[PDB]
Amino acid sequence: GVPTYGAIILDETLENVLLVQGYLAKSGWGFPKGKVNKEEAPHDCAAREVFEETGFDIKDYICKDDYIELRINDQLARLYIIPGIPKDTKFNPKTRREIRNIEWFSIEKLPCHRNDMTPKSKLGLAPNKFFMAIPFIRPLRDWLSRRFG
Numbered sequence: 478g479v480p481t482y483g484a485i486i487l488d489e490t491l492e493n494v495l496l497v498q499g500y501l502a503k504s505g506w507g508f509p510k511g512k513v514n515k516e517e518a519p520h521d522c523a524a525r526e527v528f529e530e531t532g533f534d535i536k537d538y539i540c541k542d543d544y545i546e547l548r549i550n551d552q553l554a555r556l557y558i559i560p561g562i563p564k565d566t567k568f569n570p571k572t573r574r575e576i577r578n579i580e581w582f583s584i585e586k587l588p589c590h591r592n593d594m595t596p597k598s599k600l601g602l603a604p605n606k607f608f609m610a611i612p613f614i615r616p617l618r619d620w621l622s623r624r625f626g
């Protein structure tokens with residue numbers, strides 16, 4: 478897989494993260510991110526995708542050593558951590574063909590795993606609209622503990 482880059486944007490209180498809602502195959506909520514172009518540096522791809530998806534420019538706030546990186550089915554995903562962005566910021570994409578909605582969500586209320594169907598004696602997972610965000614939630618809570626406490 479071609480690696481992906483983007484951002485976990487947090488507010489001033491560190492309670493809330495900014496998620497985006499796509500369409501079709503991307504129909505639930507996730508962190509803003511996308512596929513790197515040939516020759517493009519990681520930090521630049523991250524700023525481009527977030528600006529295309531949210532209308533907010535992160536270039537002057539990115540710290541090159543502050544990110545969470547996951548491998549998901551042999552595709553690397555890296556999200557730069559961007560704290561302290563005010564909750565009254567107005568977010569407006571270019572691409573409204575791709576993004577249904579943008580919202581702040583409480584970190585303590587987001588799931589860190591999907592629920593089984595063990596009450597139905599059935600295998601697999603129940604659907605969850607946060608499916609794409611889920612893998613980052615526990616590593617984010619751990620990173621915020623270490624960095625801030």
Ligand SMILES: CC1CCN(Cc2c[nH]c3ccccc23)CC1
Pocket residue numbers: 564566567568569570573576577578579580581
């Ligand atoms: C955080 C608040 C709720 C999100 N809003 C912007 C927004 C919501 N949905 C969208 C779809 C396309 C383009 C922009 C938007 C800013 C204030």
